[PDB]
Chains A and B, each alone.
Chain A
Amino acid sequence: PSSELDVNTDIYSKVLVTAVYLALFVVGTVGNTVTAFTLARKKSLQSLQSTVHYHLGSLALSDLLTLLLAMPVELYNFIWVHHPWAFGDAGCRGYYFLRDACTYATALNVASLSVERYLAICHPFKAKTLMSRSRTKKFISAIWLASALLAVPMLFTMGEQNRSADGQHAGGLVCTPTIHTATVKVVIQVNTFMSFIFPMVVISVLNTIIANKLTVMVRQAAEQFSMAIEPGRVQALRHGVRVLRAVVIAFVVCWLPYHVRRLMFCYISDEQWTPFLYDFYHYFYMVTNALFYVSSTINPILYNLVSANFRHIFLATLACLC
């Protein structure tokens, strides 16, 4: 037959998964493009600075395009139609190129965002010494072009194969990577470390230092240059410490399992692993890509809805279209 590529999955479970992906796609698309146009009108409303406005725009743009690009194909050809795979050989090579570039965009983008959050407080002179509009534009174009260039290896690695019992079969074409096993181990370790490890270190250490300095100011003005926000010394700084730690735990909890599963595919031996894990792996893929898309949707509300001012303009604009 062709049952070697039969992803044994419960249909009710796959239905529930597809409901979750559909809901996340709706709220992510709507909230992300609403955040984009809200923020662009906030340049037209706050009207004084565009320092990190471009960073948040790039992040919302990344999240929007990764949701709308990756979610259809990752719904159908992976969760639903596992065996035939009907969306094109160079098409699927480009598809893996796209999701790799988008993950890299979001990764290095939230990294550079947090580095800017650090550089604002730690060196209040050096941003005005460097970060002009030109510096920010060149900076985010640099981050974006790096995210484009690092993705090139997956286009050279993620092949396609009619890997059925014969060559010609019913739907035996299945977009698996076609490189050697050492090669895919190298590129998956490269993608994993380069996409997450030093983003984890950079985001974690920088936001940890930011939380430490904020807590030190909270302790120094707990019993009361000067830099004091007296009604928000409890309220605003409490929200600040909460959202800083929240952003890093959100990021860690949301992206650890995904390429953790990639590395599970990588450091996997056929002799070593039985079929029991296999079914758990397909289910784990469902849960993993689910959590990665809620990663793609979570960051906008924590970077706009954390403020009330962006929530003010966002209520003004989400009420405007509807």
Chain B
Amino acid sequence: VFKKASPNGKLTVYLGKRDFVDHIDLVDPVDGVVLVDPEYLKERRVYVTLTVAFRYGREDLDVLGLTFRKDLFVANVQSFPPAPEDKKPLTRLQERLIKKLGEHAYPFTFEIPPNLPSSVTLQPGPEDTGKALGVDYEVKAFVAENLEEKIHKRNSVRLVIRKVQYAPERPGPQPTAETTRQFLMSDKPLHLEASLDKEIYYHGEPISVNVHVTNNTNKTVKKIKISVRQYADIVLFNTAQYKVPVAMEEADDTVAPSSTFSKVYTLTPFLANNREKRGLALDGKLKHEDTNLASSTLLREGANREILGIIVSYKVKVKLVVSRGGLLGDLASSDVAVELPFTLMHPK
């Protein structure tokens, strides 16, 4: 139970939480009563409104203007004269607030759509320009006429919400991948295998690159290299594969010709350790806070959602950098590497 009033002293907006879960089909219904000045807003009906903003950077084009922002889901609530269209239930927050207020307490309750995006922002560099860039939610209160749209700035209150995720109940399989030498080149390839412990991961819990070097070649003391990348793919827009590494961790091993090797590489990536990079997915920001790296967006159960959305997906990469067939290693630059996806979610 919060309190955020109109800074002309007009209307006290009051939402219950800020983060809101994503359930099975729906996510979470928004709620919240609104106590107002029941005489000072005369001839100005309280048409409160949710808003699902979407912005974008397009950091190549951003040197000219900005990118195409679009709304997604803009509902409205004529809150004070809401006689006929009655939303039948009553929240316990609404019940206790109705006990804790009076006639000016007009209530409100919203229902998010299922196949909309979730609360993600994007990491802005030095050129801040005030607004964030990701899918950000808002609850503005318009106590005015039908299409006034005036800047009654202290007389209209805004807020922010968060449709967040949680851990899926049943964790998935044990992920792995394998490939021989795509640079075989001598009728003798070189196999390779890697794996890790779980599929879902709470943040802070590390990676565990259980690997296997499987050599059958005559060369190639392979520098093993690990890389933790996220893939933010922005669906309806220019589907930018944001190949952003989070926290790399190299290795100084070497693959003897026709030998073998296995190890396990521990890796917790961190946000502030990887800070100051444009174009990556921070999680759902506050006004300004210590937000995690953005937890991975599940695909649609029944993946029939090419919505206007920004999906978030993580995968690791085992860079077996060997490249012996050249001058010294930089001339070949072969570096056989397979990848291995996974997820990451603040479970709560």
Contact = CB atoms under 8 A, between A and B. Distances in A.
A260 to B, nearest CB: 32
A309 B64 contact: no
Given A45-B277, A47-B279, A48-B240, A124 B60 contact: no
A227 B68 contact: yes
Interface residues of A, number: 32
B253 interface: no
Q: For A49, A51, A227, A307, which residue has the most chain B Cβ atoms within 10 angstroms?
A: A49
B65 A227 contact: yes
B61 interface: yes
A237 B64 contact: yes
A48 B244 contact: yes
Interface residues of B, number: 27
B67 interface: yes
Contacts of B240: 48-49, 128
Interface in A276-308: 306-308
A201 to B, nearest CB: 23
A15 interface: no
B126 interface: yes
A120 B60 CA distance: 9
Interface string A27-62: 000000000000000000111110110000000000
A94 interface: no
Contacts, number: 83
Contacts of B129: 231-232
B127 interface: yes
A309 B126 contact: yes
A194 to B, nearest CB: 29
Given A47-B244, A121-B61, A225 B278 contact: no
B65 A47 contact: no
Contact of A124 (B66, B70, B238, B242): B238
A48 B278 contact: yes
Contacts of B58: 120
Nearest to B279: A48
B81 interface: no
B126 A312 contact: yes
A184 B339 CA distance: 56
Contacts of A84: none
Q: For A128, A214, A231, A233, which residue has the most chain B Cβ atoms within 10 angstroms?
A: A128
Given A308-B127, A309-B125, A312-B126, A46 B64 contact: no
Nearest to A45: B277
B127 A226 contact: no
B65 A217 contact: yes
A289 to B, nearest CB: 32
Contacts of A227: 65-69
Given A307-B63, A312-B126, A124 B279 contact: no
Contact of A125 (B59, B238, B277): B238
Contacts of A239: 63-64
A234 B58 CA distance: 19
A46 B280 CA distance: 9
A153 interface: no
B314 to A, nearest CB: 15
Contacts of A51: 60
A227 B126 CA distance: 21
A248 B242 CA distance: 32
A274 B222 CA distance: 71
A225 B69 contact: yes
B237 interface: yes
Given A48-B242, A49-B60, A232 B66 contact: yes
Interface string B200-220: 000000000000000000000
Contacts of B59: 46, 48-49
A240 B240 CA distance: 23
B60 A52 contact: yes
A308 B59 CA distance: 12
B238 A128 contact: yes
A309 B67 CA distance: 17
A39 to B, nearest CB: 12
A147 to B, nearest CB: 24
A214 B64 contact: yes
B64 A236 contact: yes
A120 B279 contact: no
Contacts of A52: 60
B239 interface: yes
Contacts of A307: 63
Interface string B58-96: 111101111111100000000000000000000000000
Given A49-B279, A239-B64, 10 more contacts: A45-B278, A46-B125, A46-B279, A47-B277, A48-B240, A226-B69, A227-B68, A229-B66, A309-B125, A309-B126
19 contacts: A45-B278, A46-B125, A48-B242, A49-B59, A49-B60, A49-B240, A52-B60, A120-B61, A127-B238, A128-B237, A128-B239, A225-B68, A226-B69, A226-B70, A227-B68, A236-B63, A239-B63, A309-B125, A309-B126
Query: 3 tightest CB-CB pairs across the interface, nearest first?
Result: A48-B279, A229-B66, A225-B70
